[PDB]
Structure formats: structure tokens, C-alpha cells
């Protein structure tokens, strides 16, 4: 039924953001509050950049045979990462099977949320479960650090990712239990072309508060206070305790509110996160240490599931409304602004950096956020 498409997806980003997220107790073996590296930024950014440039290719591959074979795909190579990753002792090396995992998680991603979207016509519960599978990636990242961090610390380097890989494999399983991608399913019609959904006002919209709020995000995640030569208190509880608030608050915040976004109306969910989020990354910099960095977390994590939960289910619904009902082009649009964020952090940031300090940056970034609040009026009404 359509509840194991959900389940299929769920764990599917689950097992995606674990192994994205795995990695930071191991970034500190490979070498005023806030200060950025420019070893962990190509790290941060190899990913998202291939994952940005893997998106609409896939989009268009979705529309062309089909759903299951791009997420089998995806389970094939992020296999193959895991495989690659475990014995990757060089810095080279990590990057590559980081950039292996970003195709990965391109294909799973857009693949998973378009027929998601596909199986769930109506727009009643297509939030809720647009916000199940959001929950589930929430789920996976909070969920990464201290597992990696325990299997690290307790173990060995290599065994989380082995433990990792034998879940990926009993994944797999399920997958070829569930979807059976035996033969190419071509799309009963074809989709509206990329080129011409870009010159659209209501997506664009949409896309850009999607990039704004995991900018937010990415602009902080490289520049925490984390993964530096050595620490007085030798640090190792930071690494897997860092990530904590974050991601509790997106899970608590989309697991529950989403359906009430669907009630109350959905922009009006999108303007309340985008204000959040600039409230949150404008009191940011005001923290002494990180000893306060923990509490504005909780309010843009918060405020960002809003934001994603408000939206995903908007780029299905615009298009199903004004268009044809084809996603894969569009939740790649989707995802693509998701990730512009992550791909052009670390050089955005290091620019202004070496330019102004970090604290007019945060200010600043939350000004935008502020002003672009407002825009979200204009999808109350799409024609
Ligand atoms: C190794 O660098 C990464 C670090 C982190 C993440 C991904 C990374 O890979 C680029 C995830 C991914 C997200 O989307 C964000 C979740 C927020 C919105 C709660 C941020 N978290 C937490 C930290």
C-alpha cells in the first residue's frame, strides 16, 4: 500500500543522512567563537555541489523510465561509498566517496519525494506524509553523531561503517521486496520542461525560501567551534552532542506540524519560519560562548522543517494545479535550492569572512531572510 512507498522513503533518507552525518567524528582524525577551515569546507562542499549539479539530470531520468530503477540506483552507489569509505584513509579518497554518496543522495531524494507525491494525489495528507519522510531525514541525521561517535569510540574506525552498510544491505532488501523494478516503467505523458518551469514566479518562490533557510543552516554547520587540532577537555562529546538540537527540533517540528500547515494555511507556515529563522540566526551572534549556541538551534531547526514542510508539499501542488502531474522535474528544483545553500556556503562564507566578521554576516543573513518573509504572501491564491 502507499504506506510502505512512505516507509520505502523514510528510510531511505534515514540511511542517507546517517551516513552524511557519521562522518563528524571522524573529520577530526583528517587535518571569535565561530572560525572556519578551509580543509572541512571543500569537505562540506564536494557533496553538495555534486549532488547540486546531479539533481536535474535525475529529474528528467525519473521522468524518462521510472521511480524505483534511480532509487535502486542510489542504493547500488551508496553501497559503493560505504564500501569505498570504510578503507578511505586519504583525504583524496574521502572526498570522492563523499561525492559518490552525493549522487546518492540526489537520486534517492528526488526520486523518493516524486513518487511519493505521485502516489499521494490529494493534498490532504500529502503534507503529512511529505512531512513523515522530512522527519525521517531528521530522524537520520539526529541519530548519526552519537552512533558514530559510541561505534568510534567503542570499536574502531571502520566498524560504524560496516554496521552501517549491513543496514544499508537489509534497505536494499526491502527495496527489491517493495518496489520490484523488473522492467522500465515509462511516464504515461511528458513532463513540463525544466527551462520552462523556471520562468515561473510562485516555484521560483518557493525555491529561493527553500535555499534561504538551508543557507541558514549551512552558513553555521563548517564555522561551529568543532574539529579543531585539540581541546583542553579533549573535546570527543561536542562532536556527537553538536548536532542534537537541530535536528530535534526539525523532527518535532515537521513530525507536528504539518498537517496543522495544511489546516491553518501553508504560506502562512512559511512566513512564520522564514521570521523565525531570522530571528534565530540574527540572535546567534549574540551568544558569549557555546555555551548559548545551543538555544537559537532550537528555533532555527524549528523554524526550517516549517520552512520545508510548508514548501515540498507546495512545489507538488503548483504543479499539479498549473501544470502537468509530473514531479521529478520539480521536486529536482526542490531539492536543488535545497542544496544551493550547503554548495555555496563554505565559499560564500569564507569570502565574507576574510571580508567583514562573522557577526554582520548572521545579521545580515537574517535581514534577508526578514525581507524576503513577505513574498510568501503572494502564494495564498495561485491562479
Ligand atoms: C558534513 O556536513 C554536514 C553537516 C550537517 C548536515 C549535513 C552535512 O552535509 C553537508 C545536516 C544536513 C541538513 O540538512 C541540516 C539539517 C538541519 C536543517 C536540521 C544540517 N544537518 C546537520 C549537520
Known amino acids: 500500500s502507499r504506506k510502505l512507498i512512505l516507509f520505502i522513503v523514510f528510510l531511505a533518507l534515514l540511511l542517507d543522512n546517517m551516513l552524511l552525518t557519521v562522518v563528524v567524528p571522524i573529520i577530526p582524525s583528517y587535518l571569535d567563537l565561530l572560525n572556519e577551515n578551509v580543509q572541512v569546507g571543500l569537505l562540506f562542499a564536494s557533496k553538495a555541489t555534486v549532488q547540486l549539479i546531479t539533481n536535474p539530470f535525475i529529474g528528467l531520468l525519473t521522468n524518462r523510465i521510472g521511480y524505483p530503477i534511480p532509487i535502486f540506483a542510489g542504493f547500488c552507489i551508496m553501497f559503493v561509498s560505504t564500501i569505498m569509505f570504510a578503507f578511505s584513509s586519504s583525504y583524496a579518497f574521502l572526498l570522492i566517496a563523499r561525492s559518490l554518496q552525493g549522487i546518492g543522495s540526489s537520486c534517492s531524494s528526488v526520486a523518493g519525494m516524486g513518487m511519493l507525491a505521485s502516489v499521494y494525489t490529494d493534498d490532504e495528507e500529502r503534507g503529512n506524509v511529505m512531512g513523515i519522510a522530512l522527519g525521517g531525514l531528521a530522524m537520520g541525521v539526529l541519530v548519526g553523531p552519537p552512533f558514530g561517535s559510541v561505534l568510534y569510540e567503542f570499536v574502531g574506525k571502520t566498524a560504524p561503517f560496516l554496521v552501517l552498510a549491513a543496514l544499508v544491505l537489509l534497505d536494499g532488501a526491502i527495496q527489491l521486496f517493495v ?24 516555484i521560483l518562490i518557493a525555491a529561493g525560501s527553500i535555499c534561504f533557510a538551508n543557507m541558514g543552516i549551512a552558513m553555521l554547520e563548517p564555522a561551529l567551534p568543532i574539529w579543531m587540532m585539540e581541546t583542553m577537555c579533549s573535546r570527543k ?59 537559537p538551534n532550537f528555533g532555527v531547526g524549528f523554524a526550517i ?42 565559499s560564500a562564507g569564507g569570502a565574507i569572512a576574510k571580508a567583514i566578521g562573522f557577526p554582520w554576516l548572521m545579521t545580515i543573513i537574517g535581514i534577508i531572510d526578514i525581507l524576503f518573509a513577505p513574498l510568501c504572501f503572494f502564494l495564498r491564491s495561485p491562479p
Not at 192 to 198: G, I, V, Y
Not at 275 to 294: D, E, M, R, W
Not at 313 to 338: E, K, N, Q, T
Request: hydrophobic share 50%; with cysteine; proline share 6%.
Open 179 to 202: 518496489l520490484q523494478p523488473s522492467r522500465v516503467q515509462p511516464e504515461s505523458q511528458k513532463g513540463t520542461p525544466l527551462t520552462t518551469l523556471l520562468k515561473d514566479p510562485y
Open 237 to 295: 562529546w561536542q562532536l556527537g552532542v553538536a548536532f542534537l538540537p537541530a535536528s530535534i527540533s526539525y523532527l518535532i517540528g515537521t513530525n507536528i506540524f504539518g498537517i496543522l500547515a495544511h489546516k491553518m494555511g501553508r504560506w502562512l507556515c512559511a512566513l512564520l519560519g522564514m521570521i523565525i529563522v531570522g530571528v534565530s540566526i540574527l540572535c546567534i551572534p549574540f551568544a558569549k560562548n557555546i555555551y548559548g549556541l545551543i538555544a
Open 305 to 346: 522543517g516549517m520552512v520545508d514542510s510548508s514548501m515540498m508539499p507546495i512545489m507538488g501542488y503548483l504543479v499539479d494545479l498549473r501544470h502537468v502531474s509530473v514531479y521529478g522535474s520539480v521536486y529536482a528544483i526542490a531539492d536543488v535550492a535545497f542544496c544551493m545553500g550547503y554548495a555555496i556556503g563554505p
